[PDB]
Structure 1
């Protein structure tokens, strides 16, 4: 256990910042993740051989799709790392263990299609899981990989601690269904404003961890503008392929997914920042003040989309 992972200087410094981009070198992403586990959890948290085997099977179970791919998994895990490292004393040891794994696993075996497309196509997954269809699938894939021989990274926990970590992971992964975010955020907003928010209340922590999951999942809007803008291309590449598959079933896609409305993307981003992203980081910053850099970066990117609309960029 004298075997620390170490990053080149620029990465060692910049990985601590919320806006870090993990880079185009896929083969460095596993080491970046182990580095983050070792600092946010400890060199004691997992056996290195088991953790390495788990990461590589997780990678193999992400698909070659434009956005919901292995790079997205590691990107979402890094945003969680930055949240955890900026709120040293707010989280339990089980939470530090579970949440980086949940982030790495949270889109396992994504096919690049929405819950709504699986329901309209009548995919078998839509009959097995009637709500949060893909997110129940991602959690089921995580359990599968944890059960492969030599892949049980939680083997040193008691039965009850193992049950607890798998429940943190399950709830964190379900919470990445954006349909559930609007309601979660409204309850958190009321709880904060009436001062009823209690981090010793388990159902309150669960809500706060859900919002952390949304914030990490949406973190492309918190990056430097060139990263944000190029990530948006990948996001729409998926939506528009789904739009094409909606038109093949004889269904007009929603505007978000209709490549004929390419021109409105700037205005679509404004709506998304104002309805989803800004509210997300605003409520997160109220509950967890040291996450403010996420809100500040989001607002800078909103202002860049505003520039695009005025043709100033």
Structure 2
């Protein structure tokens, strides 16, 4: 406790004051308490609190439980990454004007999913867990191993006493919401993004994309989750540089684990000894994974252009270092 009393008693600053509507938002100068306040404001301004009768104390407790469940010493996949993913979701819904295209339940599910999508992340990839015979990999048949675990943790917190922010939903709304949350969290497995994005891009290319279609709406929500998950790649250069260092720290740590536990030379992405490959790998990552997604998102909502624009600027920055 303690931290809970401080959070629950604090006056929640406006979204304007907190700057959470800005796509260029930076969490670096914020304390943990400030990120928690930002999170309460996200729920509030997305019309989720009174809408679903959330008690202030319960929401505060839930937010703190989510924050605690991240491993602070994991370099990139920690609370700050989850918080930034949620902030990008808020900005996309607000400044990006996606909010009015979705239902209240979809919004509720997306914010919860964004905040919970990496819960208890071990700092190693699905491939690593599979190669080291993780019990997690066995239980989930090597499919989206981490993501199934993140969802498991998400449910655990949602059901923990004093943290039930969904206790006010009707039976049918609860059922609908949990299904969207699971799909949203699983969507953050880049393997599923690569597997399903082809369909999304094709629908748009052939002018067949229709949000009114249940299946396409679900496909869009998955893509939106990926767009928010990768959002650091759209941030102003100083921010992208700093976060890229965190990503490298985490990947190189896994590389160390691979040399010791698997007796193998890690791929460049996880090889500290070849860190000189970072600029070129970043450009390739932006081209193959990022640009098409932000281009597609902007097509759906022009107001999301800032994400694409920021991504393009970072490609230029990384390319200048690579050439």
Gap regions ≥5 residues in structure 1: none
Q: TM-score, normalised by structure 1?
A: 0.94
Q: Which residue number corresponds to residue 37 of structure 2?
A: 31
Q: Residue 293 of structure 2: which of 255, 280, 303 is its match?
A: 280
Give the number of equivalent residue pairs: 306
Q: Secondary structure of 1:140's partner? A: helix
Structure 1 position 165 matched with structure 2 position 170: no
What is the CA-CA distance between 1:129 and the residue it aligns to? 1.1
Asked if the contact 2:298–2:305 (Cα under 8 Å) also holds between the matched residues in 1, the reply is yes
Give yes or no for contact 1:41–1:96 (8 Å, CA) kept in 2: no
Q: Please, which of 84, 87, 91 is the counterpart of residue 78 of structure 1?
A: 87
Query: Partner of 2:231 in structure 1?
Result: 219
Contact conserved, 1:247 with 1:253, CA < 8 A, in 2? yes
1:257 is matched with which residue: 246, 266, 270? 270
CA-atom RMSD in angstroms: 1.5
CA contact (8 A) 2:66 2:119 kept: yes
- Could you tell which deviates more after superposition, 101-110 or 285-294? 285-294
Match of 2:199 in 1: 187
Aligned pair partner of 2:24 in 11, 19, 29? 19
Once residues 42 and 137 of structure 1 are traced to their aligned partners in structure 2, the CA distance between those partners, rounded to angstroms, is 26
Residues 4 and 276 (structure 1), Cα distance of their counterparts in 2 relative to 1, 3 Å cut: same
Within the candidate set 5, 30, 34, 2:12 is matched to: 5
CA distance in 2: counterparts of 1:213 and 1:155, whole angstroms: 24
Distance (whole Å) between structure 2 residues aligned to residue 43 and residue 124 of structure 1: 38
CA drift of 1:33 comes to 0.5
Structure 2: give runs of 5+ residues left out of the alignment: 1-9
How much does 1:290 deviate?
A: 1.5
TM-score with structure 2 length normalisation? 0.91
Q: 2:139 aligns with which of 105, 125, 128?
A: 128
